[PDB]
């Protein structure tokens, strides 16, 4: 089953990333990104390697097999021999092609699940101060440097260090401050006017 | 694996929808819905058609096979012949039944993944102005006509056309306006009262 | 500042067949099928084969006098007949149970 990530809500892959299959792309105060994630791709490599080695070691090697001989009065046994050899040959080639054709969707859905889980982790440990925008990116209500980049990448974000300050910038963005505009609707008028009653009586 | 959509958080299917497997149901200012989504069901049809054609073309057709004859002194070869035929027959019927019994959950989980991905797309391009309610529906803080219905359906929603106006209606719903109630707690009292000190001195 | 999440891409053009699709371009792959071979006939574990040349096994065991060359051989790995191995029995007749003799021969 297509889990939705590869060629889904995430666009196609990255040419510039080299040393892995799963990486990040940061844009802090002093650089750009393209750094790998050596945890999850290691488990991916180990799983696929165990997979291929198992598929190799299940198929047994065959020993010597030589075609036999018959005279003109043993045609029946020869036809039986040909039926045996062709039947076993058809069974083995059917098993091989069917094994490959199931294993391919198995490994492609495995990669798709890896992408989606690595995305859900990054979203789940950035539960408010992120502002997702589309196709797997985040935009960071607070300020972040390389230290908190690697703090995201090792999964140790220590979120309540930033939680109030991020909140401040979030209240800048939409807020109720545009509804407020700085003063009250017009009450400061009435209090200029409650000072005007003073002037009019104390003339 | 049951991905959760069919007979899950979404209730059962729709009788009135005709021309597809995946559709929408809109209720704009001038009509009701039941329109299909010809993109995703086309890929579904093509995938299942390639699947069935592959399963057909892997099985080879068999040529002529006629039962043979033996006298009373060749019982050994005849028992060998019967063992050969029954063994191949059992292997072929086992492979056929096992192939069908795996292919059925493959295609059912394929349909389940299609439902869940088509739901995640509609949610992801309606990231604020939607107000989901349950069993795969949305309720649209702004106003929408047939043009923005097809703008949802082609996946081109151009969200920042509506983003402030939707926000206005969202601030109507819960807001802080019910906490505000129109004036201040009682400060307008003190400013009536700061006008009352005027009256009492300037008597 | 942000952290977009993505995956590897490459320039490889090799295709893998799958159930729901034909010709899926993959980044890395591995073959599991052999096609290459020499045109040579070498020895099994360092023991030379026995080439009859133009001789049949029957003419070799009977000692067909035109099979004069391979008179001194005693050991092999396997026996090579050719498409011109027609020098078997010079005098006409019937070598009875030739096939069973070949089957007993193939384990010595």
């Amino acid at each position, epitope marked *: 089953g297509l889990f939705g990530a590869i060629a889904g809500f995430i666009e196609g892959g990255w040419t510039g990333m080299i040393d892995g299959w799963y990486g990040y792309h940061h844009q802090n*105060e002093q650089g750009s990104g393209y750094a790998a994630d050596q945890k999850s791709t290691q488990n991916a490599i180990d799983g696929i390697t165990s997979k291929v080695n198992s598929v190799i070691e299940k198929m047994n090697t065959q020993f010597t097999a030589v075609g036999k001989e018959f005279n003109n009065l043993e045609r029946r046994i020869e036809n039986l021999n040909k039926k045996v050899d062709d039947g076993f040959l058809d069974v083995w080639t059917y098993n091989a092609e069917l094994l490959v054709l199931l294993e391919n969707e198995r490994t492609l859905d495995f990669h798709d699940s890896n992408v989606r889980n690595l995305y859900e982790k990054v979203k789940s440990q950035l539960r408010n101060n992120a502002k997702e925008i589309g196709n797997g990116c985040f*935009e*960071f209500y607070h300020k972040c440097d390389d230290e908190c980049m690697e703090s995201v990448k090792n999964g140790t974000y220590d979120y309540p260090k930033y939680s109030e300050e991020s909140k401040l*910038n979030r209240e800048e*963005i939409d807020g109720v401050k545009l509804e407020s505009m700085g003063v009250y609707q017009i009450l400061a008028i009435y209090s200029t006017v409650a000072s005007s009653l003073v002037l009019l009586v104390s003339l | 694996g049951l991905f959760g959509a069919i007979a899950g958080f979404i209730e059962g299917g729709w009788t009135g929808m005709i021309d597809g497997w995946y559709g929408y149901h809109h209720q704009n200012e001038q009509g009701s819905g039941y329109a299909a989504d010809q993109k995703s069901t086309q890929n579904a049809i093509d995938g299942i058609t390639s699947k069935v054609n592959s399963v057909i073309e892997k099985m080879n057709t068999q040529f002529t096979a006629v039962g043979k004859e033996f006298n009373n002194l060749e019982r050994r070869i005849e028992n060998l012949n019967k063992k050969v035929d029954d063994g191949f027959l059992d292997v072929w019927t086992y492979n056929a039944e096992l192939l069908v019994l795996l292919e059925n959950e493959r295609t059912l989980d394929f349909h389940d993944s299609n439902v869940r991905n088509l739901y995640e797309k509609v949610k992801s391009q309606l990231r604020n102005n939607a107000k989901e309610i349950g069993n795969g529906c949305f309720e649209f803080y702004h106003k929408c006509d047939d043009e923005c219905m097809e703008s949802v359906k082609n996946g081109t929603y151009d969200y920042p056309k509506y983003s402030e106006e939707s926000k206005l209606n969202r601030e109507e719903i819960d807001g802080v306006k019910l906490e505000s109630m129109g004036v201040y707690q009682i400060l307008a009292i003190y400013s009536t009262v700061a006008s009352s000190l005027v009256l009492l001195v300037s008597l | *500042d942000t952290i977009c999440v993505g995956y590897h891409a490459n320039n490889s053009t090799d295709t893998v067949d799958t159930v729901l699709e034909k010709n899926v371009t993959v980044t890395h792959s591995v073959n599991l099928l052999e096609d290459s071979h020499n045109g040579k006939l070498c020895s099994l574990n360092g023991i030379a084969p026995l080439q009859l040349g133009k001789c049949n096994v029957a003419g070799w065991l009977l000692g067909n006098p035109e099979c004069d060359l391979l008179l001194t051989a005693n050991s092999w790995s396997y026996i090579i007949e050719t498409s011109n191995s027609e020098n078997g029995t010079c005098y006409p007749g019937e070598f009875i149970d030739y096939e069973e003799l070949r089957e007993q021969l193939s384990s010595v």
Partner: antibody
Amino acid sequence: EVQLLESGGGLVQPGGSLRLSCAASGFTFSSYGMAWVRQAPGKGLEWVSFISATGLSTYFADSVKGRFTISRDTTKNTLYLQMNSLRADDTAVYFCARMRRTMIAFGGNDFWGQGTLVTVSS
Amino acid sequence: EVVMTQSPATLSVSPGEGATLSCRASQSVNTNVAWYQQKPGQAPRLLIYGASTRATGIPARFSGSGSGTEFTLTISTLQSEDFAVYYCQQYSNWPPITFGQGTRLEIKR
């Protein structure tokens, strides 16, 4: 049709302050980042600053840190840049410009302004 | 900080001919190079992005190539109007964003 109009130039005493403004017309101003690039007279180009699409990210060149701020208004479709405590070597012609995409690798700048002249001398 | 370098300083050419310019970097940007031309007293205009895909509304006699650290802009023919100032730009690693050094194009006689 997309164009960018800009103003705020003029001869100003050094150490002063300016508020340059670039208005936009013909597109959705609330869906792209914006940037500022100056040009010294008789010299090449020099990138100044950048603001993102939603305005959550601001960036400046390293030689001009702490003296320049930037903001944007959505309803006015307008970009504002505030200069503070200028120097004599910052006499240049300034350009507001639009990014072509919204990714990190944005791929150039397709639309431009037409240049305002700012002279900082005493 | 990726520092760019244009070459040569000034190209001289007769009309009805071609031209070629090289832009080099201090590190290896992948393909993320754009170019611009600029008439005197005008805003710069977009030519080519990613060194392969020409911009919308550009005649086909322009071309670009290159990868690694070196990149090349090529003009096939002229009609005496393309003589302007040329700029290369990377956008791989930023901020900050670095331009070229400017390269003008002269008529030869």
